[PDB]
Design a protein around this nucleic acid. Structure first.
Ligand SMILES: [Zn+2]
Lengths: 55, 80, 69, 101, 143, 63, 67, 206, 145, 141
RNA sequence: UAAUUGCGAUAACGAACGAGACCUUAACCUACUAAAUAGUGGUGCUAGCAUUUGCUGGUUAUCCACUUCUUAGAGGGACUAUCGGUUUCAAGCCGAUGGAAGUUUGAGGCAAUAACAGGUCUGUGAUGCCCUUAGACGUUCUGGGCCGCACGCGCGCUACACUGACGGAGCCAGCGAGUCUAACCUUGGCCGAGAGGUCUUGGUAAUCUUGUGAAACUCCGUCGUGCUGGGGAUAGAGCAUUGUAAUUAUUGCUCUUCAACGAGGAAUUCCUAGUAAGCGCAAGUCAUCAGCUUGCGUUGAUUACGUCCCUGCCCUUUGUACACACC
């Protein structure tokens, strides 16, 4: 571990800066479950006699 | 031992006690009375016992998955 | 860069430009002749020790002096 | 004939005021010197905390306040008269402590 | 017609009493008077090295006269300053307790201050006497 | 130069799209009966003396 | 701004209607009258009642009201 | 002159000068007249002031700031930028130093040079904005006298600031030379340069 | 009163301990421009070496300049306290040193190499060039260049 | 004996209690003569009631002022208010109404209110901002 | 009008909730009641200078008197008050004068009909249902991580200097908090550059810490427009404290190292007077750690008393094949 970490030629700030940057760093969001929220996702439609026999 | 003594009282004006009304409606809903039935029972009980305003806001799910809250109001209620 | 050591040419100058202007101050001395500030303050101290200038007011940030009459 | 100090404190202002009026009343039919009560500055126990149970919503704060009121009266009285005062004058909420010195 | 240190200005009195104590000199300063920064809230040592301790002595003497009884903690709180903590904001940190206690005991072995009951040090009769005399000569310094 | 010293009588109203150009009733300190409207940038009371370099514009509502 | 409300206007109009002879044209006297001939429970409200009462009395002594 | 000597000194200089006339520190608040019209009732010099530090309420109503004497307004306009938002005792010290530099540069009254500077740098014709579909055209408009005075003071202090950010010359010297040039408009002062470009662009846009 | 009337022996930028010392700045800050040495130790060295504090670097000529330089090379003999130097209880000797113009970089790289050869986490972090003090590199340290 | 009166002056937090008695005519703040108060620029500001009134009216009173609370400007303003109030109270209680009324005329002619406290008080700070009215910056994104 | 706030017009007339009123606080009180847990004056003893009676002090009980300043119970006080001008001549608004106060007197607390698939099942022995329940997804012990770094975004702190930095000197607050069957705030003394350490002392608190002698600030000196004595980031060595434990620096102190930034593009935030802004202090979580937040005080401005141009929201009139209501 220790000697492998110090002798690893891959590791380094210079190597990290040599490599490029991906677009997932600058992507923003995926707000699908706030874009569509009025529409029911359970699919359990509330029925008339359930409402009446309850409330 | 002996430095605290409990005592009891009937509560005068037992009708116009909000915690008593909430306890009574806990009892009736545990018995299985209808929400509409029992809640009107409390609102008319408070108004006949002699308060100036009453409301009950039972709220939750009863038989449907969706939860609503229907408000039984009768009398005059300040709010601020 | 300025000159901070009186090499006697700046000295006999400042002796002959006491009367050239009216309002004597540190920045006035610095802009009128190239002296690096601290030497100009020392010149002010010498000139108030023997005044061909008179003080209007003294302040640790600024010193205002006029000619003797 | 013992010179004692009687300090009362509470949170309920008018209940405390009528306790103090009773104390100055009974001292004044049985006069000792005159000893009107003295009024300490009111201590404001401030507790500031968040409105929200979670950490969502607009950051709004609240400041609950407890008010502590404290007065003292000196009495210079015999034993039975001290006992009659400190046992007859009693009201809920107002904590009264009596000290010999 | 009636002289007191309250009746004399602060800066001129403090300079005159500093020069007066320079001219006597019986102060027995500690050895580390050149190293110190007078506080941990400072970064440069004092400029006027030959008289900064004696100006401090004059200052402490005037403080002891003006107050009833104060101690080294009060003196450090007075002569403390604002510590520059780098990028963090500034803070009040007390002054150098060692040089404050050394100037207090130097004044004590002169005989200006004494030990007061209930803690602290208070002004002495001869300290106030010579302080009043120097307050005089600063009052009648006018030509 | 024809500098003109004016003297306001009444304020007409705060025109301007952003709402700062006040309309006032200026007299010109030389003739009581000779008066005209004016548009003023700054805030205005009665009985103050304005100055004009052109006294023949006769402007109106700004959009 | 300083617009008086229905509470002060209603109370002031009723008081001025039924107590015209005893009322005076000054605020201090009129507010003492309001203290005695009204069982009002608020001090600042009492001052507001008396102020609108005084203003309406000024208008009454100058001319008729349509209220 | 009848001095009354007490146990406390109360020196004779301030004794005589401020028993005789309510001055500045030592400067006459009489004999000063506004050389031009259209700025009177706003440039307040008719009431003397000893030191510009006053705890006077001026921003409550409409134009108590116009009631306020002008030297305090010079201080409170010198007060700007975040380094010294707060230090008006120091600003009063600066203003006193400026008045002394005025005295040594010219023998006339420093409150009179302040009045002359404001008079000669109040911008006579400004330009307001109009919607104007397209290029958002602007239209020339004359200026109320209080706005004249306010912009004049603002131009004075901003010119002093920009001319004395990074220089050997102090704020007192820079403000004094700006005041001298604004009193005698010599096309050198920042305030009168700003005034001239304002009149030029307004005359072009009318 | 402290006007100086000297004409010829004022000198320009001078030499002391492998560094270009400015000749027209104050002596304490010229010693500060000397590397390995900062403001407070410079002031203590001047005051203690009895060198005239008031004036720049033109006089304070040779013989006090060698007094200055010897007081830097051996501070400990003349009542400079042990805590005022930059390196103490050092690595393998324990006697107190002050590093100067070139020895400071040589020996900071030396004790970095020491902990690198002991294969410390500090050594690995210095080898990688990242922040060796406990610091958050998630947000700062950008654009090392 | 000792015909003395006590007055007060109040800036934002400074309270200045002034004792005014009939004596030789000296004026002092905090045990020191008032020509020795250190803002060094508001020396005229402590001179203000002296030079408004006149030295002869001050030539027979001893005023001693004790000073607590507030910053230095609060101190000097509390002093000025306290000694003006001391003069008007002494002149009310011992000498003629034209004297005190003419001095009130002078005071309200020059006044920076000179006798009545500034009612301006610092309003409390609200949550969501580091100032009394200013709030934290929002970003929207 | 801040307001469905109120005048008026009027098939409407009277009311109710919300607003307002209410409460809490900051302003004023020479008016009552007071006060050795707050101050003042005077009488004793005593110190000094001048002595020419005074000034500055001390003095836990040497005594008396007082409540202006401190505290707060009961109260009062302001209601746009009076006048002038405008208005439908009304609602109201502008100015002057008076007054402590003429911004709804300043500022909050509470705050209607209701909704939202807003957030919280990680606050709850509040919780339905599901999953798991002994090689446990329960509990407990050790170590690591949550802090990891090519980069993008948001809130802040220090700065770019002389309207300043550095060293002395002057001295100025308020909000609070602080230990019993344990280790809180710590005065004073002593050691030490410092951080800190040892002997004690006081305080269960208007009593002591503490007048929290705070910073900004004022004066006097040094610096002299230079990446500078701005800036103190990175960085090495040592000295201490907290805790069983500081390594991946807890934090503090000393020396040394002396980076970028010379005022910030497109954009955009907050704000109308004790306000913005500058400047600090206390509390919260705390054994330690504040660049954070909540409160408080110090210094304390520019500009406006408007408008719907922009951006949001409301009402009305319109249109609708929508009503799960433009997702
Ligand atoms: Zn619970």
């Amino acid at each position: 571990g220790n000697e492998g970490a110090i002798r690893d030629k891959t590791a380094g700030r210079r190597n990290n800066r040599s490599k490029d940057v991906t677009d997932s760093a600058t992507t923003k969001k995926s707000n699908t479950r706030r874009a569509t929220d009025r529409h029911s996702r359970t699919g359990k439609t509330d029925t008339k006699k359930k409402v009446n026999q309850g409330w | 031992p002996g430095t605290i003594v409990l005592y009891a009282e009937r509560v005068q004006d037992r009708g116009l006690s909000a915690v008593a009304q909430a306890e009574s409606m806990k009892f009736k809903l545990l018995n299985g009375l209808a929400i509409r039935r029992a809640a009107y029972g409390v609102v008319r009980y408070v108004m006949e016992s002699g308060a100036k305003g009453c409301e009950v806001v039972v709220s939750g799910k009863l038989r449907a998955a969706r939860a609503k809250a229907m408000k039984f109001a009768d009398g005059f209620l300040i709010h601020s | 860069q300025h000159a901070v050591i009186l090499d006697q040419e700046k000295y006999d100058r400042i002796l002959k430009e006491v009367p050239t202007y009216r309002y004597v101050s540190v920045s006035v001395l610095v802009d009128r002749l190239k002296i690096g500030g601290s030497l100009a303050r020392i010149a002010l101290r010498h000139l108030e020790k023997e005044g061909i200038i008179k003080p209007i007011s003294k302040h640790s940030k600024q010193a205002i002096y006029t000619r003797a009459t | 004939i013992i010179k004692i100090r009687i300090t009362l404190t509470s949170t309920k202002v008018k209940q405390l005021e009528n306790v103090s009026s009773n104390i100055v009343k009974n001292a004044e039919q049985h006069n000792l010197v005159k000893k009107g009560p003295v009024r300490l500055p009111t201590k404001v126990l401030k507790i500031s905390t968040r409105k929200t149970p979670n950490g969502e919503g607009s950051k709004t704060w609240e400041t609950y306040e407890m008010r502590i009121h404290k007065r003292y009266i000196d009495l210079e009285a015999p034993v039975q008269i001290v006992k009659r005062i400190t046992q007859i004058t009693i009201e809920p909420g107002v904590d009264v402590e009596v000290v010999v010195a | 017609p009636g002289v007191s240190v309250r009746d004399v200005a602060a800066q001129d009195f403090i300079n005159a009493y500093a020069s007066f104590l320079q001219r006597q000199g019986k102060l027995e300063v500690p050895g580390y008077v050149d190293i110190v920064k007078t506080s941990s809230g400072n970064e440069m040592p004092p400029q006027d090295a030959e008289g900064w301790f004696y100006k401090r002595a004059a200052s402490v003497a005037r403080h002891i006269y003006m107050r009833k009884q104060v101690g080294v903690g009060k003196l450090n709180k007075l002569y403390g300053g604002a510590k520059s903590r780098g990028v963090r904001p500034y803070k009040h940190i007390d002054a150098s307790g060692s040089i404050n206690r050394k100037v207090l005991q130097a004044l004590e072995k002169i005989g200006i201050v004494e030990i007061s009951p209930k803690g602290g040090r208070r002004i002495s009769e001869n300290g106030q006497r010579d302080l009043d005399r120097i307050a005089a000569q600063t009052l009648e310094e006018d030509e | 130069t024809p500098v003109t010293l004016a003297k306001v009588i009444k304020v007409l109203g705060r025109t301007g799209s952003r709402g700062g150009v006040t309309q006032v009733r200026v007299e010109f300190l030389e003739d009581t009966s000779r008066t005209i409207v004016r548009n003023v940038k700054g805030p205005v009371r009665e009985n103050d003396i304005l100055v004009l370099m052109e006294s023949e514009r006769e402007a109106r509502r700004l959009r | 701004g300083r617009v008086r409300t229905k509470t002060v206007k209603r109370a002031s109009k009723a008081l001025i209607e039924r107590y015209y002879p005893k009322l005076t044209l000054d605020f201090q006297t009129n507010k003492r009258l309001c203290d005695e001939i009204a069982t009002i429970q608020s001090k600042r409200l009492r001052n507001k009642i008396a102020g609108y009462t005084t203003h309406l009395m000024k208008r009454i002594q100058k001319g008729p009201v349509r209220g | 002159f009848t001095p009354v000597v007490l146990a406390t000194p109360i020196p004779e200089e301030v004794q005589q000068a401020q028993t005789e006339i309510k001055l500045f520190n030592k400067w006459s608040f009489e004999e000063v007249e506004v050389k031009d019209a259209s700025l009177v009732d706003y440039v307040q010099v008719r009431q003397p002031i000893f030191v510009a530090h006053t705890a006077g309420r001026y921003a409550n109503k409409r134009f108590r700031k116009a009631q306020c004497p002008i030297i305090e307004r010079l201080t409170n306009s010198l007060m700007m930028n975040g380094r010294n938002n707060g230090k008006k005792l120091k600003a009063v010290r600066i203003i006193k130093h400026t008045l002394d530099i005025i005295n040594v540069l010219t023998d006339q009254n420093p409150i009179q040079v302040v009045v002359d500077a404001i008079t000669n740098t109040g911008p006579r014709e400004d330009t307001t904005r109009v919607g104007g579909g397209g290029a958002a055209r602007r239209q020339a408009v004359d200026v109320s006298p209080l706005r004249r005075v306010n912009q004049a003071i603002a131009l004075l202090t901003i010119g002093a600031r920009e001319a004395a950010f990074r220089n050997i010359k102090t704020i007192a010297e820079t403000l004094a030379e700006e005041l001298i040039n604004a009193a005698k408009g010599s096309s050198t002062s920042y305030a009168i340069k700003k005034k001239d470009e304002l009149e030029r662009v307004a005359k072009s846009n009318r | 009163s402290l006007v100086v009337q000297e004409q010829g022996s004022f000198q320009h930028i001078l030499r002391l301990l492998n560094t270009n010392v400015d000749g027209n700045i104050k002596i304490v800050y010229a010693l500060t421009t000397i590397k390995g040495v900062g403001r407070r130790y410079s002031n203590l060295v001047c005051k203690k070496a009895d060198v005239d504090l008031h004036k720049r670097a033109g006089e304070l000529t040779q013989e006090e300049l060698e007094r200055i330089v010897q007081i830097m090379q051996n501070p400990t003999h003349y009542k400079i306290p042990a805590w005022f130097l930059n390196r103490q209880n050092d690595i393998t000797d324990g006697k107190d040193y002050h590093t100067l113009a070139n020895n400071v970089e040589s020996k900071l790289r030396d004790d970095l190499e020491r902990l690198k050869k002991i294969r410390a986490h500090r050594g690995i972090r210095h080898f990688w060039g990242l922040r060796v003090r406990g610091q958050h590199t998630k947000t700062t340290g950008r654009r090392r260049a | 004996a000792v015909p003395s009166v006590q007055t007060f002056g109040k800036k934002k937090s400074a309270t200045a209690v002034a004792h005014v008695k009939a004596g030789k005519g000296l004026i002092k703040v905090n045990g020191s003569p008032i020509t020795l108060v250190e803002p060094e620029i508001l020396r005229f500001k402590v001179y203000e009631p002296l030079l408004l009134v006149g030295l002869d009216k001050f030539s027979n009173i001893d005023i001693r002022v004790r000073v607590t609370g507030g910053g230095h400007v609060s101190q000097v303003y509390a002093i000025r208010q306290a000694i003006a109030k001391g003069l008007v109270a002494y002149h009310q209680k011992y000498v003629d109404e034209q004297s005190k009324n003419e001095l009130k005329k002078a005071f309200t002619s020059y006044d920076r209110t000179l006798l009545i406290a500034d009612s301006r008080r610092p309003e409390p700070k609200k949550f969501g901002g580091k100032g009394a009215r200013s709030r934290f910056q929002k970003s929207y994104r």
